[PDB]
Amino acid sequence: SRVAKAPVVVPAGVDVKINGQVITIKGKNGELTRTLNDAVEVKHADNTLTFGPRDGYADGWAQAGTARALLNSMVIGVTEGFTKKLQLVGVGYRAAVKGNVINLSLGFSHPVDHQLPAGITAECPTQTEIVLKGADKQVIGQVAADLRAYRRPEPYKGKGVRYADEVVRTKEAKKK
Amino acid sequence: AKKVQAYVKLQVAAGMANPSPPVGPALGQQGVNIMEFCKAFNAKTDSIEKGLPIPVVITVYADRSFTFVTKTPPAAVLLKKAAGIKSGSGKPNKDKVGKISRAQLQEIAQTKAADMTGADIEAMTRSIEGTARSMGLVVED
């Protein structure tokens, strides 16, 4: 029911600079946190999400539901920010955190690098747990997933880079 | 899943009870400790009359000590034991076993009248009515 036609009214929780179509959310924690949602038939007034007449379709007030998700995700990035627990079972390998750059491994001899984009940073309490910490739910989950593409969980007994996967499959030797 | 657990079920041999051995190898594989042996082996054991394999009930909670408790056999079991019946039907009421006096049920209600649910002995007797018919046994006059 609710979000398709009453778009949560995305409150101004300190604080929203709205040009018009270019949006900057201006708060402390990942400061001046910004997104350009353009005029995708998404009209705004103060911190509200308002429709117009899309292409052929004309929808039903749908991407005003979306625009409300993407601005609030953006606002909540600047207020609360958040825990990307990414983690390894994999016989440790590498997992040097160093500021903007992460050195991981997959048994592969070479520095695996990956340079974190500016907007986020990461650290490791122990090699097997990595917290990427910071700002925007979109770039941050992308860097997490691109790190788990340094290798999936192995599906039989689970070796790999684990982000949200607290459900890794537990297959077995020589059939059951 | 859902966290720590209430009322875990185990169903267990009618051995020496103070000594372990017909219970011992079923105990052995699940890591019934020397400590687990003390709550179950030392105790809730002999000076109770063996004749039925005894229910043993697990409460899970742990600083490395989760516990195993001995009590009375269950209503289905007591029905089979108490009535002096053969063994239950193949097809309830479309095949048949026995007849049973309602008064025997009532004494059956009375022994099982501990935690068995039915807020009334009359209600209590009826659940075991519905057990007796399920086994084929008509509660009968």
Partner: protein, 164 residues
């Protein structure tokens, strides 16, 4: 309209029980598990103490629209009706027993006659003499707590700030 056939039938019965409770308690579910209801549930319907947990969305709108021994406001959330028609102890002996797996404040409040009994009062509703002398001790008590305690207590915490 209105779902099930018990739900349109029940309105005279819930309304009947909701008059009946000459002591009543509004109390909380969520996180009970089976046991805390069960262990009273069996014995109660023999023993003369009642505990039901009943539809709080219907009870909260129903109570507004029908006085059920006054009351209404603080039913909100997941809600049990504990009740004794009897002198107050059976209802109140039950609650610290419900306190082992939750707390004292899962009752939000209770009612006796027309006086509001919260947990502060509840120990006192829970202290009850021999029956013929009790109902007199209970009538002098509720008549005391109604207007005398307010006019003293509203002054006294402001006197605590003035007088240190």
């Amino acid at each position: 309209a209105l779902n099930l056939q018990d739900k349109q039938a029940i309105v005279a019965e819930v309304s009947e029980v909701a008059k009946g409770a000459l002591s009543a308690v509004v109390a909380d579910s969520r996180g009970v598990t089976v046991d805390k209801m069960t262990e009273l549930r069996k014995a109660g319907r023999e023993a003369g103490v009642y505990m039901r947990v009943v539809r709080n969305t219907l009870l909260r709108r129903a109570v507004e629209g029908t006085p059920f021994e006054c009351l209404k406001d603080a039913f909100v959330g997941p809600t049990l009706i504990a009740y004794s028609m009897e002198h107050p102890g059976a209802a109140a002996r039950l609650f610290k027993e419900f306190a082992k797996a939750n707390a004292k404040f899962e009752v939000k409040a209770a009612a006796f006659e027309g006086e509001l009994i919260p947990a502060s009062q509840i120990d006192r509703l829970a202290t009850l003499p021999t029956y013929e002398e009790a109902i007199a001790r209970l009538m002098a008590t509720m008549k005391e707590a109604s207007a005398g305690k307010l006019v003293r207590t509203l002054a006294a915490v402001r006197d605590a700030k003035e007088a240190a």
